[PDB]
Amino acid sequence: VRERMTTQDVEAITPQTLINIRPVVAAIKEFFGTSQLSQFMDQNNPLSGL
Amino acid sequence: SFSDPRFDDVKAPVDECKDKDMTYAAPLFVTAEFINNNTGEIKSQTVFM
Amino acid sequence: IFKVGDTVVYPHHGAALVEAIETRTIKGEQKEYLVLKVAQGDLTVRVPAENAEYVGVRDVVGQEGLDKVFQVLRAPHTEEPTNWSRRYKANLEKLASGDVNKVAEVVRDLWRRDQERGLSAGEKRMLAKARQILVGELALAESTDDAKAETILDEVLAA
Ligand SMILES: C/C(=C\[C@H](C)CCCCC(=O)O)[C@@H]1O[C@@H]2C=C[C@@H]1OC(=O)\C=C/C=C\C=C\[C@H]1O[C@@H]3C[C@H]1O[C@@H](/C=C/C[C@H]1O[C@H](C[C@H](O)[C@H]1C)[C@@H](O)[C@@H](O)/C=C/CC/C=C/C2)[C@@H]3C
Numbered sequence: 109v110r111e112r113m114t115t116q117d118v119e120a121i122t123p124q125t126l127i128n129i130r131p132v133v134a135a136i137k138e139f140f141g142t143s144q145l146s147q148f149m150d151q152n153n154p155l156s157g158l
Numbered sequence: 159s160f161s162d163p164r165f166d167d168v169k170a171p172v173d174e175c176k177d178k179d180m181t182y183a184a185p186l187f188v189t190a191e192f193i194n195n196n197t198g199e200i201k202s203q204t205v206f207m
Numbered sequence: 208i209f210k211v212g213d214t215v216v217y218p219h220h221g222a223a224l225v226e227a228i229e230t231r232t233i234k235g236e237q238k239e240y241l242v243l244k245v246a247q248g249d250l251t252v253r254v255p256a257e258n259a260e261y262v263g264v265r266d267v268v269g270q271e272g273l274d275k276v277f278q279v280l281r282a283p284h285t286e287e288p289t290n291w292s293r294r295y296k297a298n299l300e301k302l303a304s305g306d307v308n309k310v311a312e313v314v315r316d317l318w319r320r321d322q323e324r325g326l327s328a329g330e331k332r333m334l335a336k337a338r339q340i341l342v343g344e345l346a347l348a349e350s351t352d353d354a355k356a357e358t359i360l361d362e363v364l365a366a
Contacts, residue, residue: 117303118196119218119219119262119263120303122203123190123192123201123205124203124248124250126192127190127205129205129206132207198254198258199252199262200252200253201252202250203249
């Protein structure tokens, strides 16, 4: 946003144009898969999930 | 600016997601706001996050 | 000048509607912040009524402007050198300028062009975007629909 605040022209831009959500959604998808703390639920008896 | 996050319903229930291998997600919605200092504006949308 | 319900045309974001006048304040002065929402991106704009002419808001265009843009159309005489990058830069500067007659000149130039030889993808997207905002302006000036204004174009696009 701070980059394209300057390169864009004024009196034409909007928050729909300024905002790129793809690094945020890539950070979420890169956390939930392929991290240490996000593991498969160990279920072979209900004590193990707990 | 950035303000007021609000959620929708989940797009698909639990068993259907576990069946069709979709994740159990819900959309974000955030009211962004752009203010021009020189001439005076706000630009308020509902940005899908 | 402004009243509630005037479909007043914002310069870049097409034609917009007003709802009320906010008397909100900065530094104690409750300026007449007209709340002006658009229908394209569903965004609402609040603008102080003082510098509305400075930002370049404009009321809707009438029959004399309709005859002027029909005069700008149907007159196929133009010259631009064949280095198409200069033509692209010229019509992009036009599109950032925001004048209805020049927008009509560029959509008639690109209609004359793609009717003749063929266009690139960015050229076609440029013609489509400028034509769609011109359709929106002509429809909200003549108080009618998109298909009606597009048929009006297709019968005045050098027909
Ligand atoms: C070494 C380690 C996790 C090991 C893979 C499992 C625990 C080792 C301890 C032990 O031997 O009991 C560390 O885990 C985390 C971060 C760094 C380390 O990961 C690491 O560096 C190593 C792997 C990190 C993420 C792996 C993700 C995916 O790899 C597959 C699918 C995803 O997860 C793995 C499965 C993990 C569940 C395990 O659960 C264990 C039993 C089995 O070993 C597994 C079923 C149970 O002991 C369970 O109750 C306990 C889990 C530990 C809780 C997390 C601690 C920190 C499966 C192999």
